[PDB]
Design a protein around this motif. Structure first.
Motif, mmCIF file in Angstrom:
data_model
loop_
_atom_site.group_PDB
_atom_site.id
_atom_site.type_symbol
_atom_site.label_atom_id
_atom_site.label_comp_id
_atom_site.label_asym_id
_atom_site.label_seq_id
_atom_site.Cartn_x
_atom_site.Cartn_y
_atom_site.Cartn_z
ATOM 1 N N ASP B 2 0.831 -1.205 0.000
ATOM 2 C CA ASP B 2 0.000 0.000 0.000
ATOM 3 C C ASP B 2 0.869 1.261 0.000
ATOM 4 N N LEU B 3 1.550 1.457 -1.134
ATOM 5 C CA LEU B 3 2.461 2.591 -1.290
ATOM 6 C C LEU B 3 1.815 3.908 -0.882
ATOM 7 N N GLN B 4 0.497 4.034 -1.047
ATOM 8 C CA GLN B 4 -0.168 5.256 -0.609
ATOM 9 C C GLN B 4 -0.071 5.420 0.899
ATOM 10 N N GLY B 5 -0.291 4.333 1.640
ATOM 11 C CA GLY B 5 -0.151 4.395 3.084
ATOM 12 C C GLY B 5 1.227 4.857 3.507
ATOM 13 N N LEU B 24 -1.224 15.898 -1.757
ATOM 14 C CA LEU B 24 0.100 15.860 -2.359
ATOM 15 C C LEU B 24 0.406 14.527 -3.024
ATOM 16 N N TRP B 25 -0.534 13.585 -3.030
ATOM 17 C CA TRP B 25 -0.287 12.295 -3.653
ATOM 18 C C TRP B 25 -0.991 12.113 -4.988
ATOM 19 N N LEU B 26 -2.066 12.852 -5.258
ATOM 20 C CA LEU B 26 -2.797 12.690 -6.515
ATOM 21 C C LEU B 26 -1.917 12.778 -7.758
ATOM 22 N N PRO B 27 -0.990 13.734 -7.883
ATOM 23 C CA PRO B 27 -0.135 13.756 -9.075
ATOM 24 C C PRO B 27 0.598 12.456 -9.327
ATOM 25 N N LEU B 28 0.895 11.665 -8.295
ATOM 26 C CA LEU B 28 1.672 10.446 -8.513
ATOM 27 C C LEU B 28 0.952 9.465 -9.432
ATOM 28 N N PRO B 29 -0.256 8.982 -9.119
ATOM 29 C CA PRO B 29 -0.945 8.146 -10.108
ATOM 30 C C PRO B 29 -1.431 8.935 -11.307
ATOM 31 N N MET B 30 -1.803 10.209 -11.127
ATOM 32 C CA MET B 30 -2.286 10.974 -12.268
ATOM 33 C C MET B 30 -1.219 11.168 -13.333
ATOM 34 N N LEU B 31 0.058 10.983 -12.997
ATOM 35 C CA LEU B 31 1.101 10.990 -14.009
ATOM 36 C C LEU B 31 1.682 9.617 -14.291
ATOM 37 N N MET B 32 1.523 8.648 -13.389
ATOM 38 C CA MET B 32 1.873 7.280 -13.751
ATOM 39 C C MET B 32 0.989 6.779 -14.884
ATOM 40 N N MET B 33 -0.305 7.101 -14.837
ATOM 41 C CA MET B 33 -1.175 6.702 -15.938
ATOM 42 C C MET B 33 -0.845 7.461 -17.217
ATOM 43 N N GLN B 117 -5.775 -4.775 -9.088
ATOM 44 C CA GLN B 117 -6.588 -4.123 -8.071
ATOM 45 C C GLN B 117 -5.716 -3.219 -7.214
ATOM 46 N N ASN B 118 -6.292 -2.109 -6.756
ATOM 47 C CA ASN B 118 -5.569 -1.070 -6.031
ATOM 48 C C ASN B 118 -4.442 -0.469 -6.860
ATOM 49 N N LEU B 119 -4.432 -0.723 -8.163
ATOM 50 C CA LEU B 119 -3.397 -0.229 -9.058
ATOM 51 C C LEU B 119 -3.992 0.658 -10.142
ATOM 52 N N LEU B 120 -5.078 1.351 -9.815
ATOM 53 C CA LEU B 120 -5.764 2.197 -10.777
ATOM 54 C C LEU B 120 -6.138 3.507 -10.107
ATOM 55 N N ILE B 121 -6.294 4.545 -10.923
ATOM 56 C CA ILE B 121 -6.684 5.854 -10.414
ATOM 57 C C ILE B 121 -8.166 5.810 -10.069
ATOM 58 N N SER B 122 -8.482 5.617 -8.789
ATOM 59 C CA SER B 122 -9.811 5.937 -8.278
ATOM 60 C C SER B 122 -10.900 5.167 -9.028
ATOM 61 N N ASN B 123 -10.945 3.861 -8.772
ATOM 62 C CA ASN B 123 -12.056 3.057 -9.265
ATOM 63 C C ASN B 123 -13.365 3.791 -9.015
HETATM 64 C C1 LIG Z 1 6.969 20.606 -4.913
HETATM 65 C C2 LIG Z 1 6.640 20.466 -6.382
HETATM 66 C C3 LIG Z 1 5.790 19.221 -6.639
HETATM 67 C C4 LIG Z 1 5.332 19.098 -8.093
HETATM 68 C C5 LIG Z 1 4.861 17.684 -8.421
HETATM 69 C C6 LIG Z 1 5.378 17.188 -9.774
HETATM 70 C C7 LIG Z 1 6.603 16.287 -9.632
HETATM 71 C C8 LIG Z 1 6.308 14.827 -9.967
HETATM 72 C C9 LIG Z 1 6.857 13.851 -8.920
HETATM 73 C C10 LIG Z 1 7.745 12.748 -9.510
HETATM 74 C C11 LIG Z 1 7.152 12.097 -10.769
HETATM 75 C C12 LIG Z 1 6.871 10.598 -10.615
HETATM 76 C C13 LIG Z 1 5.839 10.091 -11.611
HETATM 77 C C14 LIG Z 1 5.554 8.609 -11.421
HETATM 78 C C15 LIG Z 1 5.933 8.106 -10.034
HETATM 79 C C16 LIG Z 1 5.251 6.797 -9.645
HETATM 80 C C17 LIG Z 1 4.183 6.998 -8.580
HETATM 81 C C18 LIG Z 1 3.473 5.706 -8.375
HETATM 82 O O1 LIG Z 1 4.084 4.714 -8.417
HETATM 83 O O2 LIG Z 1 2.089 5.543 -8.135
HETATM 84 C C19 LIG Z 1 1.564 4.297 -7.761
HETATM 85 C C20 LIG Z 1 0.233 4.331 -8.436
HETATM 86 C C21 LIG Z 1 -0.935 4.497 -7.512
HETATM 87 O O3 LIG Z 1 -1.800 3.387 -7.320
HETATM 88 C C22 LIG Z 1 -1.519 2.522 -6.220
HETATM 89 O O4 LIG Z 1 -2.723 2.186 -5.536
HETATM 90 C C23 LIG Z 1 -2.769 1.212 -4.475
HETATM 91 C C24 LIG Z 1 -3.374 1.876 -3.246
HETATM 92 O O5 LIG Z 1 -4.785 1.974 -3.323
HETATM 93 C C25 LIG Z 1 -5.345 3.227 -3.701
HETATM 94 O O6 LIG Z 1 -4.674 3.683 -4.866
HETATM 95 C C26 LIG Z 1 -5.377 4.355 -5.897
HETATM 96 C C27 LIG Z 1 -5.381 5.764 -5.480
HETATM 97 O O7 LIG Z 1 -6.278 5.692 -4.386
HETATM 98 C C28 LIG Z 1 -6.760 3.807 -6.142
HETATM 99 O O8 LIG Z 1 -7.774 4.724 -5.783
HETATM 100 C C29 LIG Z 1 -7.021 2.618 -5.321
HETATM 101 O O9 LIG Z 1 -8.326 2.174 -5.548
HETATM 102 C C30 LIG Z 1 -6.819 3.095 -3.945
HETATM 103 O O10 LIG Z 1 -7.395 2.138 -3.103
HETATM 104 C C31 LIG Z 1 -1.359 0.675 -4.385
HETATM 105 O O11 LIG Z 1 -1.187 -0.288 -3.382
HETATM 106 C C32 LIG Z 1 -0.515 1.855 -4.143
HETATM 107 O O12 LIG Z 1 -0.771 2.216 -2.813
HETATM 108 C C33 LIG Z 1 -0.969 3.031 -4.950
HETATM 109 O O13 LIG Z 1 0.037 4.003 -5.083
HETATM 110 O O14 LIG Z 1 0.015 3.193 -9.186
HETATM 111 C C34 LIG Z 1 -1.105 3.342 -10.049
HETATM 112 O O15 LIG Z 1 -1.844 4.248 -10.013
HETATM 113 C C35 LIG Z 1 -1.390 2.345 -11.090
HETATM 114 C C36 LIG Z 1 -0.964 2.958 -12.379
HETATM 115 C C37 LIG Z 1 0.377 2.395 -12.643
HETATM 116 C C38 LIG Z 1 0.163 0.969 -13.013
HETATM 117 C C39 LIG Z 1 1.365 0.546 -13.777
HETATM 118 C C40 LIG Z 1 0.908 -0.467 -14.766
HETATM 119 C C41 LIG Z 1 2.162 -0.057 -15.491
HETATM 120 C C42 LIG Z 1 1.947 -0.275 -16.956
HETATM 121 C C43 LIG Z 1 2.975 -1.228 -17.460
HETATM 122 C C44 LIG Z 1 4.254 -0.522 -17.825
HETATM 123 C C45 LIG Z 1 4.655 -0.957 -19.204
HETATM 124 C C46 LIG Z 1 3.737 -0.287 -20.175
HETATM 125 C C47 LIG Z 1 4.373 -0.296 -21.536
HETATM 126 C C48 LIG Z 1 3.417 -0.989 -22.465
HETATM 127 C C49 LIG Z 1 2.072 -0.298 -22.471
HETATM 128 C C50 LIG Z 1 1.212 -0.885 -23.565
HETATM 129 C C51 LIG Z 1 -0.219 -0.720 -23.171
#
Ligand SMILES: CCCCCCCCCCCCCCCCCC(=O)OC[C@H](CO[C@@H]1O[C@H](CO[C@H]2O[C@H](CO)[C@H](O)[C@H](O)[C@H]2O)[C@H](O)[C@H](O)[C@H]1O)OC(=O)CCCCCCCCCCCCCCCCC
Ligand SMILES: CCCCCCCCCCCCCCCCCC(=O)OC[C@H](CO[C@@H]1O[C@H](CO[C@H]2O[C@H](CO)[C@H](O)[C@H](O)[C@H]2O)[C@H](O)[C@H](O)[C@H]1O)OC(=O)CCCCCCCCCCCCCCCCC
Ligand SMILES: CCCCCCCCCCCCCCCC(=O)OC[C@H](CO[C@@H]1O[C@H](CS(=O)(=O)O)[C@@H](O)[C@H](O)[C@H]1O)OC(=O)CCCCCCCCCCCCCCC
Ligand code: SF4
Ligand code: SF4
Lengths: 147, 361, 110, 55, 193, 76
Positions: B2-5, B24-33, B117-123
């Motif tokens: 639970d990286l968010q925790g 301060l955590w929303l940008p992290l998944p909002m830019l991972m996607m 599961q838990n790997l998506l932006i806000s089911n």
């Molecule tokens: C002071 C100035 C500040 C300015 C800010 C700007 C600077 C930016 C900061 C640094 C930039 C970093 C960007 C990415 C960092 C990674 C963050 C991350 O790791 O973020 C992790 C995120 C978040 O989701 C995760 O979510 C779970 C937690 O649950 C919660 O997480 C979500 C958020 O709540 C959901 O809502 C979920 O339902 C909710 O319950 C996990 O256990 C983690 O806790 C949680 O982080 O991962 C997800 O969102 C899932 C999406 C990723 C899935 C990956 C699948 C990867 C795809 C395959 C790759 C190969 C593709 C190539 C081929 C493609 C062909 C199709």
């Protein structure tokens, strides 16, 4: 090593006549010409296969005879030396004039030796000759590579 | 894990107003996607150019990178540096906005792509229905690209594009309807967790309807009418030069990776290495707080999602070079004359089978 | 619709360039000598070219506005430009552009 | 191997294998052989080793 | 009246599905075969024995009879003779051919009486300046390219120089010959019984 | 005594990152450069899937590789 400094220009100023070995896709040696041009040197590429003695075309004059095609009986043009005329038309602050030859493979060892020797005399004049070859853009002095 | 925790806790350890950490955590998944969407676009361009070459006994880009890997990068960077043109009497503000209205809602629909599961932006609670609603804004973009042009060539293309994107929205909704009947809901995670031991085996007609409708979103050479070069030059795209054209070039492959992932999650499931994996109690793993098993199953789920997304991307860019084009009227007869009746029939059949056999539905 | 005689370093139209557009007019006969800068120009040479253009459009014209006659005017303007370049009033650009001597190579007048 | 002589080609890895021609010009160790045949006299350059001065 | 229409509709739909499945199988099969692409810059295709490339000119053999100028479709070759007065011998001062105007039909090479003019296998002519395509009498000899003697090119024969039954020329051994026997070999076999 | 699992999980996915974008992409380059003109249809599909999955890693070390044909011995 995927990014080059300015060693090419130093080596050209040292030797005077280089012999590139560009890869046969032709997009990776233009940056070295741009490096040359950014220092102050002006380039002019003229595709070696198509020049004459290389002494009548570069140093002396030569009478070009255009293509009359049944009309316009034979006439000569006498275009000026392709070097002595471009050494006069250099920009005000110009470090020299290097001569680029694209298809250097077609020339002969005699013409290569001539182009090498021509660099010592005629001061503001360097030479690059893209002799085809290696899979990386490597160079070597043109006085070498022959004999 | 639970990286968010961990993120919010370690950020609250130094104060910083715990409620503010969650902001301060929303940008992290909002830019991972965003990252995975852009990589998917690069992959789609590369796959198209390298698979069309294999199909035709050929070789794709090979002098850009090692295997033409840098070919999409070059094709994008070129379009960045290109001079943009705005013709004489064309509108100035609907011009530079069409290619953006056709792109913004295609990106926004990545909220619901699970990747495990838990790997998506806000089911979301609306989930797939929100995607059905958002996929109806692109026709506005095409009408906008056609209306803001002094070229009657391209207005006729914008019209026949906006008239095809609305023809394949009713069957595309009637397939998701039959999927949501079984799924008990609309959220993608809740849609997929009904696969606990796949909807393609119980919706063998809704799958066909969904897939055909998604391929007929002005995407593939089966249809691709506004891109059909021979009959008309690029349709509405015939006047966009720099990044404005790259927005079309890009909003058409992201709209393909999106559909591949969505067919995966609806009919196959971004989870479930085919055996009922979570019944791996045979290794006596305490999944619940197993620090790893969690990461191992995360990787397995990501791989199993990408396998079945790549399956459909491959099959789409293979049909591109297999199925002949239809004029525009053989196209508008697929929807409203074959796909809409079969969609209604599939919905009624799923209803009858859910009312009679509530088990397995 | 426009009627034009467009060649290298001469571009005659049948309209008025108000801000960058063309707007066919049926009596303006705009002119756009050397857009791509194949040559380097002076203030006297451009005035000579404008004067030639005027005496070519005004003193000899009572004929139709077909594209044939527009080409016929552009050809004479381009022969005049080539004569100017032969006499030496102007010269090639020598800039880092394409540099293909479309009007002839430099010779030594023997 | 001098110009004017009639030569044949002895190299099994060449498209002009067992062809016969006349030496037109030799420079830098490599030769140029003219095959008069067909309709248009062909001229191709061989190494000094891929020939044989046929009598 | 209405059942025949429906059975025709079914016989058309299932046929259209099978005739798409067949094409899909054919295309998925096509991606197993080796690509026929002749990867030019590193796999240059060796030309034929009659390929009409750049003209080659031996200044010493020319007698200045101007038949090259006369059988040319566009009278292209510039011949500048002076007619020295020793007894009658014409003297050649400048021979040239503007390869920018050239047509590469080789009528000039066909009618040269002294074998002074020939064709080559140089198809790689390209310049930034067309005025550099006018070849002097010296820029014409220049000992042609010979693609085979290039350290970064794997020559590839074309269809007429591949052994019997062979269609592609990519995966080829190092001992292939054109198609059959040459006349001297057939005559030698006929000589012995 | 940093045998804490809080550090061991950091170690394992820090090794996983390197394996995903530094190690396996190079193996994919090697394998797919070796068996390209001889691969069957399903093998071609699997190779393209391999490129698709590791694309973020294949991009990083793409500029550091030459697949040029390695000049041959000419005289032979
Ligand atoms: C002071 C100035 C500040 C300015 C800010 C700007 C600077 C930016 C900061 C640094 C930039 C970093 C960007 C990415 C960092 C990674 C963050 C991350 O790791 O973020 C992790 C995120 C978040 O989701 C995760 O979510 C779970 C937690 O649950 C919660 O997480 C979500 C958020 O709540 C959901 O809502 C979920 O339902 C909710 O319950 C996990 O256990 C983690 O806790 C949680 O982080 O991962 C997800 O969102 C899932 C999406 C990723 C899935 C990956 C699948 C990867 C795809 C395959 C790759 C190969 C593709 C190539 C081929 C493609 C062909 C199709
Ligand atoms: C261009 C396209 C490609 C570009 C690549 C994308 C750019 C990012 C590059 C960074 C890559 C380094 C990351 C290493 C991967 C290992 C991290 C991981 O797996 O972490 C997984 C964790 C797991 O999250 C937790 O997972 C737990 C359990 O897993 C669950 O996951 C699913 C939900 O049920 C399954 O169903 C499973 O059964 C279930 O138990 C719980 O769900 C928790 O709620 C949840 O928080 O999430 C996380 O932090 C992951 C969040 C980061 C996303 C990045 C993933 C990249 C994909 C790498 C895949 C590698 C494949 C093999 C590599 C070696 C080659 C063989
Ligand atoms: C939502 C977020 C998304 C944001 C979008 C992301 C945008 C990313 C933009 C950046 C993309 C750039 C990719 C470049 C790839 C590439 O160059 O191709 C690789 C090619 C391949 O040839 C190479 O050349 C070598 C041969 S040779 O010597 O060059 O001839 C040899 O290595 C072989 O040919 C081959 O390897 O390399 C070249 O040909 C020469 C080009 C030189 C490239 C410059 C180096 C990069 C420097 C970056 C700038 C840094 C500034 C500081 C430096 C001091
Ligand atoms: S090469 Fe032949 S045709 Fe040409 S001038 Fe000499 S003899 Fe005459
Ligand atoms: S190739 Fe044709 S155009 Fe050229 S000299 Fe020979 S006959 Fe004349």
């Amino acid at each position: 090593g995927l990014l080059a400094g300015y060693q090419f220009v130093k080596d050209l100023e040292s030797a005077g006549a280089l012999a590139l070995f560009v890869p046969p896709e032709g997009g990776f040696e233009g940056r070295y010409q741009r490096r040359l041009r950014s220092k102050g040197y002006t380039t002019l590429p003229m595709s070696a296969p198509g020049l004459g003695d290389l002494a009548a075309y570069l140093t002396q004059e030569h009478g070009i005879r255009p293509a009359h095609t049944g009309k316009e009986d034979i006439r000569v043009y006498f275009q000026p030396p392709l070097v002595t005329y471009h050494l006069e038309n250099l920009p005000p602050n110009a470090k020299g004039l290097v001569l680029w030859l694209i298809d250097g493979k077609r020339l002969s060892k005699q013409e290569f030796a001539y182009l090498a020797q021509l660099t010592q005399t005629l001061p503001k004049f360097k030479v690059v000759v893209e002799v085809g070859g290696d899979r990386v853009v490597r160079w070597e002095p043109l006085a070498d590579w022959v004999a | 894990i639970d990286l968010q925790g961990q993120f919010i806790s370690a950020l609250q350890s130094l104060g910083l107003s715990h409620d503010l950490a969650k902001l301060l955590w929303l940008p992290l998944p909002m830019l991972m996607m965003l990252i995975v969407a852009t990589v998917g676009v690069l992959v789609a361009v590369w796959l198209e150019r390298k698979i069309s070459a294999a199909v035709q006994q050929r070789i794709g880009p090979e002098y850009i990178g090692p295997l033409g890997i840098l070919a999409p990068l070059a094709d994008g960077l070129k379009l960045i540096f290109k001079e943009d043109v705005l013709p004489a009497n064309s509108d100035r503000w609907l011009f530079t906005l069409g290619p953006a209205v056709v792109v913004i809602p295609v990106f926004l629909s990545y909220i619901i792509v699970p990747f495990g599961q838990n790997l998506l932006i806000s089911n979301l609670a609306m989930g797939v229905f929100l995607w059905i609603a958002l996929s109806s804004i692109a026709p506005i973009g095409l009408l906008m690209a056609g209306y803001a042009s002094n070229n009657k060539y391209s207005l006729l293309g914008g019209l026949r594009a906006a008239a095809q994107s609305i023809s394949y929205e009713i069957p595309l909704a009637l397939a998701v309807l039959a999927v949501a009947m079984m799924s008990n809901g609309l959220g993608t995670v809740e849609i997929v967790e009904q696969q606990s031991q796949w909807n393609v085996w119980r919706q063998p007609i809704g799958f066909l309807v969904f897939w055909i409708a998604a391929l007929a979103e002005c995407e593939r050479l089966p249809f691709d009418l506004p891109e059909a070069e021979e009959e008309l030059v690029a349709g509405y795209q015939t006047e966009y030069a720099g990044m404005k054209f790259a927005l079309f070039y890009l909003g058409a492959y992201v709209n393909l990776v999106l559909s591949a992932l969505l067919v995966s999650v609806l009919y196959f499931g971004g989870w479930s290495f085919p055996i009922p994996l979570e019944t791996i109690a045979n290794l006596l793993g305490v999944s619940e707080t197993n620090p790893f098993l969690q990461i191992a199953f995360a990787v397995l789920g990501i791989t199993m999602t990408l396998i079945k997304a790549y399956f459909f991307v491959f099959l789409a860019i293979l049909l591109r070079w297999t199925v002949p084009r239809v004029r525009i009227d053989q196209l508008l007869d697929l929807g409203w004359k074959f796909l809409l009746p079969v969609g209604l029939v599939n919905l009624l059949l799923t209803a009858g089978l859910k009312l009679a056999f509530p088990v397995a539905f | 619709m426009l009627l034009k005689s467009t060649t290298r370093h001469v571009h005659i139209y049948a309209g008025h360039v108000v801000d960058g557009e063309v707007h066919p007019d049926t009596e303006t006969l705009t002119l756009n000598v050397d857009p791509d800068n194949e040559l380097e120009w002076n203030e006297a040479a451009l005035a000579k070219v404008e004067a030639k253009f005027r005496e070519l459009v005004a003193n000899a014209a009572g004929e139709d506005l077909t594209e044939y006659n527009l080409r016929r005017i552009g050809s004479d303007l381009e022969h005049f430009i080539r004569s100017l370049l032969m006499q030496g009033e102007i010269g090639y650009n020598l800039n880092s552009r394409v540099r293909n001597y479309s009007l002839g190579i430099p010779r030594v007048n023997h | 191997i001098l110009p004017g002589m009639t030569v044949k080609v002895t190299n099994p890895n060449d498209t002009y294998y067992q062809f016969q021609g006349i030496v037109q010009r030799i420079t830098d160790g490599k030769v140029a052989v003219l095959f008069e045949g067909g309709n248009w006299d062909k001229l191709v350059t061989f190494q000094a080793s891929e020939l044989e001065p046929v009598v | 009246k209405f059942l025949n229409q429906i059975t025709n509709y079914a016989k058309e739909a299932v046929q259209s599905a099978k005739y798409i499945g067949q094409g899909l199988s054919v295309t998925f099969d096509h991606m197993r075969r080796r690509p026929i692409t002749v990867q030019y810059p590193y796999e240059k295709l060796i030309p034929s024995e009659r390929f009409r490339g750049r003209i080659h000119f031996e200044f010493d053999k020319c007698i200045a009879c101007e038949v090259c100028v006369r059988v040319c479709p566009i009278n292209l070759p510039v011949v500048d003779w002076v007619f020295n007065k020793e007894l009658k011998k014409k003297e050649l001062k400048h021979y040239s051919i503007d390869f920018g105007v050239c047509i590469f039909c080789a009528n000039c090479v066909e009618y040269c009486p002294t074998n002074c003019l020939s064709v080559t296998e140089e198809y790689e002519l390209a310049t930034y300046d067309r005025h550099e395509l006018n070849y002097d009498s010296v820029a014409m000899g220049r000992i042609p390219y010979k693609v085979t003697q290039d350290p970064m090119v794997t020559p590839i024969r074309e269809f007429a120089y591949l052994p019997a039954g062979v269609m592609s020329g990519h995966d080829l051994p190092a001992g292939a010959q054109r198609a059959g026997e040459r006349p001297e070999a057939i005559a030698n076999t006929a000589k012995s019984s | 005594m940093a045998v804490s699992t809080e550090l061991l999980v950091l170690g394992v996915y820090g090794a996983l990152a390197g394996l995903y974008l530094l190690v396996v992409p190079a193996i994919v380059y090697a394998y797919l450069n070796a068996r390209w003109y001889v691969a069957s249809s399903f093998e071609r599909a699997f190779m393209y899937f391999l490129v698709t999955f590791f694309f973020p890693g294949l991009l990083l070390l793409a500029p550091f590789i030459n697949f040029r044909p390695q000049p041959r011995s000419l005289n032979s």
